[PDB]
Amino acid sequence: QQRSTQLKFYDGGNRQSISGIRATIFGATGFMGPYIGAALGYIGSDVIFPHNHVYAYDDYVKELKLCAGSGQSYIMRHFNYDDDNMYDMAIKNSNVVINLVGSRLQNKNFQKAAYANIHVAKKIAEACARNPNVRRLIHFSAAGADTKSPSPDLHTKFHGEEAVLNAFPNATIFRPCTVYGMQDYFIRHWIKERDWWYHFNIVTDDCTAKRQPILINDVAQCVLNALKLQESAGQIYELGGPHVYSRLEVFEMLANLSGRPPKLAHIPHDIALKITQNFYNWEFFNMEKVIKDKLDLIVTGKHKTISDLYVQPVSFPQGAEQFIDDVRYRGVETHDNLEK
Amino acid sequence: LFRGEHALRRYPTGEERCIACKLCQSACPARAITIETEPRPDGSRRTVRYDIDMTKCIYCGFCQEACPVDAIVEGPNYEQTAYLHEDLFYDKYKLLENGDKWEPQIARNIEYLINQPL
Amino acid sequence: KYNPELYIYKTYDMAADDPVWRQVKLDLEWTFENIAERRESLGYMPTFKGDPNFWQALDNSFSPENIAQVQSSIGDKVTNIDTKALALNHQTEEYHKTSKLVYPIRTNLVVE
Amino acid sequence: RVDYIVTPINAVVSWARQGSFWPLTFGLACCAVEMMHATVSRYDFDRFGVIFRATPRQADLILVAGTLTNKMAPGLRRLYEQTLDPKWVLSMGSCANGGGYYHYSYSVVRGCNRIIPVDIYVPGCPPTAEALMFGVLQLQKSLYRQINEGEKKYNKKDLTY
Amino acid sequence: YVGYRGRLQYIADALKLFIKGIVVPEGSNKFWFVAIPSAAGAICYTFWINSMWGPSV
Amino acid sequence: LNKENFNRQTTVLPHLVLSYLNKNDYNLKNTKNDYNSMEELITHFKYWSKGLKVESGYTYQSV
Amino acid sequence: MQNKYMQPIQLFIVFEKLNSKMWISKKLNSNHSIALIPSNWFYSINLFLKRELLFSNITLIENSAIDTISYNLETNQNDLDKTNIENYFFKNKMLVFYNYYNYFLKSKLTLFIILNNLNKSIDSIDRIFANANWLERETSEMYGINYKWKIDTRKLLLDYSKIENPMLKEFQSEGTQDAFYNIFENQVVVLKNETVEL
Amino acid sequence: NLNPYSYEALKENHWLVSDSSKKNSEWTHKSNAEQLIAKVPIIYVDSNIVRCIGGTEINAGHPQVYIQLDTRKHGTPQTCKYCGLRYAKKMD
Amino acid sequence: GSEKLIEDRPYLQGMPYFDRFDYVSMMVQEHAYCLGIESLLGTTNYSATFTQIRTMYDELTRI
Amino acid sequence: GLWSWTINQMLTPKFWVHLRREGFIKTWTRGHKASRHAHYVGGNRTDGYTKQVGEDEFGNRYYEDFDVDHKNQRRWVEFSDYFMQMWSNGDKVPVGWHGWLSHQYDDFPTRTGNSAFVKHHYLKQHTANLSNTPLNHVPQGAPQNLNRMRFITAQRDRSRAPWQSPKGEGVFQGKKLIVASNSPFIDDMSIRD
Amino acid sequence: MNHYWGSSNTIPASSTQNNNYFSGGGNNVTIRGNEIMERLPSQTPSQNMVQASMKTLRFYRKFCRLIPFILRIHNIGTKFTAQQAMINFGNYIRERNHYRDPGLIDHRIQLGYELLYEAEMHFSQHTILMQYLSPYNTPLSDRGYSYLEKVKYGNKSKFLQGFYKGNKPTEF
Numbered sequence A: 001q002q003r004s005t006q007l008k009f010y011d012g013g014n015r016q017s018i019s020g021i022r023a024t025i026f027g028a029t030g031f032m033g034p035y036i037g038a039a040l041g042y043i044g045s046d047v048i049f050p051h052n053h054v055y056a057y058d059d060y061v062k063e064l065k066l067c068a069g070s071g072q073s074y075i076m077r078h079f080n081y082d083d084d085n086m087y088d089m090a091i092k093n094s095n096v097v098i099n100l101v102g103s104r105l106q107n108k109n110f111q112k113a114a115y116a117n118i119h120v121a122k123k124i125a126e127a128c129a130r131n132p133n134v135r136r137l138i139h140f141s142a143a144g145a146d147t148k149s150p151s152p153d154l155h156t157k158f159h160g161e162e163a164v165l166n167a168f169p170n171a172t173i174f175r176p177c178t179v180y181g182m183q184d185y186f187i188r189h190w191i192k193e194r195d196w197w198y199h200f201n202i203v204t205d206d207c208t209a210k211r212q213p214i215l216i217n218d219v220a221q222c223v224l225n226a227l228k229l230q231e232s233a234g235q236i237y238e239l240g241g242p243h244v245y246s247r248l249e250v251f252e253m254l255a256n257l258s259g260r261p262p263k264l265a266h267i268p269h270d271i272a273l274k275i276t277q278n279f280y281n282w283e284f285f286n287m288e289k290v291i292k293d294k295l296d297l298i299v300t301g302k303h304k305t306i307s308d309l310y311v312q313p314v315s316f317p318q319g320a321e322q323f324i325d326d327v328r329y330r331g332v333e334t335h336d337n338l339e340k
Numbered sequence B: 001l002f003r004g005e006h007a008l009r010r011y012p013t014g015e016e017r018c019i020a021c022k023l024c025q026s027a028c029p030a031r032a033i034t035i036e037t038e039p040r041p042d043g044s045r046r047t048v049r050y051d052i053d054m055t056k057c058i059y060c061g062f063c064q065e066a067c068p069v070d071a072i073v074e075g076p077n078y079e080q081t082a083y084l085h086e087d088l089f090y091d092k093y094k095l096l097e098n099g100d101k102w103e104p105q106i107a108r109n110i111e112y113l114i115n116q117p118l
Numbered sequence C: 001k002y003n004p005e006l007y008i009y010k011t012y013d014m015a016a017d018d019p020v021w022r023q024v025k026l027d028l029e030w031t032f033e034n035i036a037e038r039r040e041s042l043g044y045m046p047t048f049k050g051d052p053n054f055w056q057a058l059d060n061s062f063s064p065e066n067i068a069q070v071q072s073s074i075g076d077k078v079t080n081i082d083t084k085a086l087a088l089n090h091q092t093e094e095y096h097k098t099s100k101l102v103y104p105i106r107t108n109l110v111v112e
Numbered sequence D: 001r002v003d004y005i006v007t008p009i010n011a012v013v014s015w016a017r018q019g020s021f022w023p024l025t026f027g028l029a030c031c032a033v034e035m036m037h038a039t040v041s042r043y044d045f046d047r048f049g050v051i052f053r054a055t056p057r058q059a060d061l062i063l064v065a066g067t068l069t070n071k072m073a074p075g076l077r078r079l080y081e082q083t084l085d086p087k088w089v090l091s092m093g094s095c096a097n098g099g100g101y102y103h104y105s106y107s108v109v110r111g112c113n114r115i116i117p118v119d120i121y122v123p124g125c126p127p128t129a130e131a132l133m134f135g136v137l138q139l140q141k142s143l144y145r146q147i148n149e150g151e152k153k154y155n156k157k158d159l160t161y
Numbered sequence E: 001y002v003g004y005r006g007r008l009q010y011i012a013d014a015l016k017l018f019i020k021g022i023v024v025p026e027g028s029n030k031f032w033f034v035a036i037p038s039a040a041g042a043i044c045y046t047f048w049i050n051s052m053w054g055p056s057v
Numbered sequence F: 001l002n003k004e005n006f007n008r009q010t011t012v013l014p015h016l017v018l019s020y021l022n023k024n025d026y027n028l029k030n031t032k033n034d035y036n037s038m039e040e041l042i043t044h045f046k047y048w049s050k051g052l053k054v055e056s057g058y059t060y061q062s063v
Numbered sequence G: 001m002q003n004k005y006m007q008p009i010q011l012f013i014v015f016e017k018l019n020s021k022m023w024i025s026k027k028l029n030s031n032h033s034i035a036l037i038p039s040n041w042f043y044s045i046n047l048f049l050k051r052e053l054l055f056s057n058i059t060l061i062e063n064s065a066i067d068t069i070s071y072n073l074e075t076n077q078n079d080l081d082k083t084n085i086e087n088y089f090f091k092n093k094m095l096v097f098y099n100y101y102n103y104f105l106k107s108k109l110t111l112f113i114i115l116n117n118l119n120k121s122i123d124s125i126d127r128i129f130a131n132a133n134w135l136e137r138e139t140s141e142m143y144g145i146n147y148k149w150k151i152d153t154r155k156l157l158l159d160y161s162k163i164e165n166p167m168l169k170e171f172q173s174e175g176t177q178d179a180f181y182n183i184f185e186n187q188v189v190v191l192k193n194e195t196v197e198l
Numbered sequence H: 001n002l003n004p005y006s007y008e009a010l011k012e013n014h015w016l017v018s019d020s021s022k023k024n025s026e027w028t029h030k031s032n033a034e035q036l037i038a039k040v041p042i043i044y045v046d047s048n049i050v051r052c053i054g055g056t057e058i059n060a061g062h063p064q065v066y067i068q069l070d071t072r073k074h075g076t077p078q079t080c081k082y083c084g085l086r087y088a089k090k091m092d
Numbered sequence I: 001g002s003e004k005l006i007e008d009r010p011y012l013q014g015m016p017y018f019d020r021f022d023y024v025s026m027m028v029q030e031h032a033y034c035l036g037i038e039s040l041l042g043t044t045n046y047s048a049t050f051t052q053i054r055t056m057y058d059e060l061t062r063i
Numbered sequence J: 001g002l003w004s005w006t007i008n009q010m011l012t013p014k015f016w017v018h019l020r021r022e023g024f025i026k027t028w029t030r031g032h033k034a035s036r037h038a039h040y041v042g043g044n045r046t047d048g049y050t051k052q053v054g055e056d057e058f059g060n061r062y063y064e065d066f067d068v069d070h071k072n073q074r075r076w077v078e079f080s081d082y083f084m085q086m087w088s089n090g091d092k093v094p095v096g097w098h099g100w101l102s103h104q105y106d107d108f109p110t111r112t113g114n115s116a117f118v119k120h121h122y123l124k125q126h127t128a129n130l131s132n133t134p135l136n137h138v139p140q141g142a143p144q145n146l147n148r149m150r151f152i153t154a155q156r157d158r159s160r161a162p163w164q165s166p167k168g169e170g171v172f173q174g175k176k177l178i179v180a181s182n183s184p185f186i187d188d189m190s191i192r193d
Numbered sequence K: 001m002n003h004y005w006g007s008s009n010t011i012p013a014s015s016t017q018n019n020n021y022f023s024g025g026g027n028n029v030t031i032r033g034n035e036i037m038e039r040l041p042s043q044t045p046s047q048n049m050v051q052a053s054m055k056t057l058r059f060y061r062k063f064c065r066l067i068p069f070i071l072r073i074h075n076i077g078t079k080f081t082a083q084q085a086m087i088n089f090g091n092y093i094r095e096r097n098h099y100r101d102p103g104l105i106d107h108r109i110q111l112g113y114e115l116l117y118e119a120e121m122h123f124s125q126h127t128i129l130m131q132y133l134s135p136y137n138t139p140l141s142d143r144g145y146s147y148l149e150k151v152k153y154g155n156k157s158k159f160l161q162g163f164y165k166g167n168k169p170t171e172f
């Protein structure tokens, strides 16, 4: 090869040190963005965050500014996403490019879902192929990405994987399985839905779909380890949890940890699909959520696993029990539990 | 006498007044002034780096008190509010352009202050 | 200890509740009145007026030709660099330009 | 076609939030004293609608005006987290900006931006009440403009999509 | 400076209090935390029914 | 009353006592600065680089 | 010093077992007297000061320790006499000074107690003078002084869950820790500090 | 015109790499002051020793410095070491 | 750590630290520090005493 | 911004004189440009309006009136840009007028004639607060700076300048790669006579 | 006893009873007391290293009896179990087992009691007080760990592990 994938950086430093990593993280205004930036920025690395997020006063961009210290974290506002010049400027002085851009679950239009995933991934990969100083490109797709997937997000994520591998052959395609955390869309969504209905969680199937949740801290550690391994260049890594669970099992585990009795109110899948297709979709109500509820997102074993980049993920019961502290059921308790 | 924004002055000929003597750096109570000096090719003694951390500056006027050529001063400009901690990291470019912008009023005030014992 | 002097709050005016503070107030007013009288009698006040001639590259110790050429090289069209004035101000120690604030102090209106 | 409605309502919402900017009654030091001076008669924040609320729940602005110590950084982080959205942050003074006089101290955070995200910085030590009012007014203008900065592009019919 | 010479200050205050987000502390009872303000708003808007503006008006 | 004098302008003269009792020090401070005298420039350089040297000892001053 | 002055020699008259060493200076006030006091005879000395006529009208004005392990005469070394509190600083390793004011005698007293034991242990007069609570807490947290028989030993100005003695010549100004915000913890953590150097 | 780093150029320019353009100084020293002072011509003074204060009054410029215009080579320009002004004898 | 910061700086470079001790009374602390330095130097501020500036501004600070 | 001049303030010779002089647009926009008080539009006195003390390079007009009811309100500026109530700010006042408006001195800039301020060749025009704009102050090595790598290399080269290893095919004399020395200095002893 | 650890400084079980209708009682050993700590008097000076060691053991006993409450109220029960926290603090004490000055040991015991009270009364943050409970050579039990160093540096010496990592940044 003529494009060096070597990335010599010092990870033993702290916030005010220098690691030698100059990274541009596209699509960091979501959920995994702040954690990836913190993973890069907490070892003393320069991080740039391009964004076009509406309502620039949202906590997402502001917390993105907190990923690295002063003089190391920069935030590009009003990124065009259609300007090759802007893409070149975003990674002019960067040797790592991390593309977390993907169609949001709120989206249901295929053209917009195809736009974000395929178009932005292709443009980022092409920009990485024009700047010789870029060493690594880590592209984040989903686990159940396939051309036959009913979900436009998964279909266009498979297309984006193919486009990134074509444009930048030395890319690392991460396919995490149901990332969960504090600002996630899995445990936070479970809590908020159960609190809004107060009587049940809305299910649209038998909840037999397979899930392999992985912690966001584990995903960040996987990113760091992949940057520490040259064998990860141009390879597909599936980031799954230690075990595979159905949606019913995940509901049962969350209920047992929080103590809330699990009530699962069923709605016909066809009716749910109709109402989600024909109505406005937001974060908590979307055809993408329905379709992913009727899909399996686990490690299929067709590519390298999290064990290939050498991260031992924590168990989903452990992570969830860490993240459900204040939503615990207040049943009959010891008098010593009154003093908190 | 108002102590506003640190700025670098220049002679009426356009030559910068600072001679890179680091007296302001030694006299800065909060150590906000960092000076690195390399002689200019013509042979003069000038700063190649003159940085003032406006986040580490207590706006005390010791730099202009200790300056023997009245190069560093504190102009009246107090509307130096910035949206970035990096924007608050002043360098020689910013100090020189600020002194160029604010030289007339700075010159007037410094002239009046000089005429007090004179 | 055997004959204390107490200050007692009696009226609305703390100054009026003490003979010394009334005298202090009267002293302040008398000072204001006499300063006003002294300033009105003169009818004007000297003031410091800045001038660009203060900020030149050469002092009076240099010849008028050198001062003129240095000021013309730097393109200063505001300073007075005429050789006649420079020669008549060679090695002089005048204090500074001063203006006069002329009483009464009133607003400049536009009445039509 | 929903952009027909939201954009005028975007302007109305921005005007409403800038016209009732309520900062949290939380000060630490000489900067807090100057902040109090920025409220009283001579410089009236009530003219622009800036009235202080004692609890972070009722405050839109977190005005970090003073020195943040390692014994206080969790407190400032909790105060920022408990402030109801949308919220903005103004770091007043050299201590809040980057440590200031005590940047080389063992018990100073060396800037509140290390703990909470800062929206705007006022540099003085202490900033004059005029400087603080300038920072507040600039923040109000920015947050008025922040609701619609032109992120959405214009189609052939000049309606943002 | 809200409106011209501060004419629309109250409108701005009311609209801002509308726009301000609300989160219920997870250690608090959500039902009562939301219901008591609703009951207060219902009761405070029963004041104007007990008001005379003239003889039997 | 004078007509071309600061004494005419103002009654308070915050330098009359100092010029009355320490006229030598007053003249030395006014006329000599770090721009025309070598000793004053040396004092200025040592004052803003290392500072004034203080004799060893313990003091307690209360105000 | 043209005022009426008298040494507080009655203290050493009563205790009759202490080598009295007193200093006056024009660097101090004219009513200020410095006296050397042994560590063993400090609680008794303070009992006598608190409950004796012409001394009972006294208050504890100040209290602080000096880490004299690194005390060096930077200038005028040869001018050091044989009767100098500077010499007493030189020979020893720590010394706690207590400043009292006597209203009856209109006088200032400064007792110096010399510590050479490594643990820096000394009795606490917190149970005699109410000032000594927070003053001695500051002295203990900043200099590592072990105040035996103290009313309250908790720290006063130091950060929670931190054990250090910052006011020592060995301790650098920048310290050893810095508090940051950790996204993975969603809260403030403490890490090694890489501070700036001028 | 002469190539820098040569013996003659170094001996002339105080054993420093002379730059005619001075925009190299504009980059390195973050100021075009070298060009701005190169615009200023040479001042000719009759006396053997000239005095420079930087301006018109004391405290308005730099401390007084005395420049010797009576050099080994007649009419040799001498630069102020506080400002950038150059002085020389009237004739030689 | 104001005391340690003062101990790590010259006398004048640690003088502004006393402004922030009592930011309500920012000149009395300066006066106390200057009196301590003068007592260490064994002198007095004749100019400040004769100009009445210290007493006047300390009373303004008290107000 | 309706009723810039109140009716009671329009029943005043000042309003009619200003209307006859500057016209309706300029007369009405004055209450919007520098809204201070209802009775302070154009000056406190009613027989006339305050004469314009001076004009700014940015179109701002500066007035001084000694008849205001408080001493700290005698000098004011009316801005050219008055689009919103909270639009104008204190950073639009230039260098010359900043001191006059802040009562640092009684001198004010003049377009022509005798000047109270120096006018040197290196002076730059005043600019408002450029933060939160693309023209904000960028440190030479900040990530926002697109030429940061040059500055970082300049930093590193002062104490640890790296050795430029050969990059490509080179002449080999046995095991040694032959590349010419890149020293700008010339050893004249090797080239002499 | 007029102390924070006094037997009467217990939170009542009910609003009208201490424990029951026939007996009193309360829990201040494993949870916090009813009243805040106004004063924390000095440990009585120990003339013997024996007494210093007894003080150390009693302080460790008090800490161990209180660690489930600390884990529960600080939401760190998933990072380590109660026994894991006890073992980690035991390792912390073992690193200080070489102390031989009874006065210094008394000072350390006072500091440890103060820190334990700080963590007991929510004075200190959980992310800051967990450094004493954090494991030394093992990862935290609430997040995934990386064994890349263990695998790549298989059975290599600690010197080689430090050598391949480095002690300074490689860019400056």
Ligand SMILES: CCCCCCCCCCCCCCCCCC(=O)OC[C@H](COP(=O)([O-])OCC[N+](C)(C)C)OC(=O)CCCCCCCCCCCCCCCCC
Pocket (backbone or CB within 6 Å): E031, E035, E036, E038, E039, E040, E042, E043, E046
């Ligand atoms: C905690 C109670 C302390 C003593 C309270 C003594 C009376 C106080 C009266 C003042 C107002 C109190 C709050 C009123 C609103 C909540 C009602 C309530 O308690 O519901 C409990 C009931 C029962 O609550 P629940 O569901 O939690 O109880 C189930 C029983 N447990 C949990 C014990 C197993 O709530 C409901 O039924 C909820 C739905 C209906 C809500 C109806 C009220 C909503 C507000 C409407 C306006 C009210 C004011 C109208 C004014 C008219 C003009 C004067």
Ligand SMILES: NC(=O)C1=CN([C@@H]2O[C@H](COP(=O)(O)OP(=O)(O)OC[C@H]3O[C@@H](n4cnc5c(N)ncnc54)[C@H](OP(=O)(O)O)[C@@H]3O)[C@@H](O)[C@H]2O)C=CC1
Pocket (backbone or CB within 6 Å): A026, A027, A028, A029, A030, A031, A032, A033, A052, A053, A054, A081, A100, A101, A102, A103, A104, A105, A112, A115, A116, A120, A140, A141, A142, A143, A175, A176, A177, A178, A179, A180, A185
């Ligand atoms: N979270 C999970 O459980 C999993 C996520 N993934 C994928 O990993 C990636 C990172 O995760 P996550 O943070 O949760 O993702 P999110 O869905 O929460 O965030 C998507 C990001 O892409 C941006 N974006 C979306 N649409 C567009 C568009 N049309 N043009 C430009 N930018 C756009 C968003 O910015 P803006 O705010 O402007 O819309 C945001 O920064 C995503 O691609 C996600 O789908 C994969 C497996 C599991």
Ligand code: SF4
Pocket (backbone or CB within 6 Å): B006, B024, B027, B028, B029, B030, B031, B032, B033, B052, B056, B057, B058, B059, B060, B061, B062, B063, B064, B074
């Ligand atoms: S004003 Fe004081 S703190 Fe600020 S740069 Fe100048 S000397 Fe340093």
Ligand code: SF4
Pocket (backbone or CB within 6 Å): B017, B018, B019, B020, B021, B022, B023, B024, B025, B035, B063, B066, B067, B068, B069, B070, B071, B072
């Ligand atoms: S004191 Fe003045 S001349 Fe000396 S280095 Fe500082 S700015 Fe330059």
Ligand code: SF4
Pocket (backbone or CB within 6 Å): B058, D029, D030, D031, D032, D065, D066, D067, D092, D093, D094, D095, D096, D100, D101, D124, D125, D126, D127, I020
């Ligand atoms: S920045 Fe200056 S004025 Fe503000 S708190 Fe710190 S020391 Fe006080």
Ligand SMILES: [Zn+2]
Pocket (backbone or CB within 6 Å): H052, H053, H054, H062, H065, H080, H081, H082, H083, H084, H085
């Ligand atoms: Zn000169």
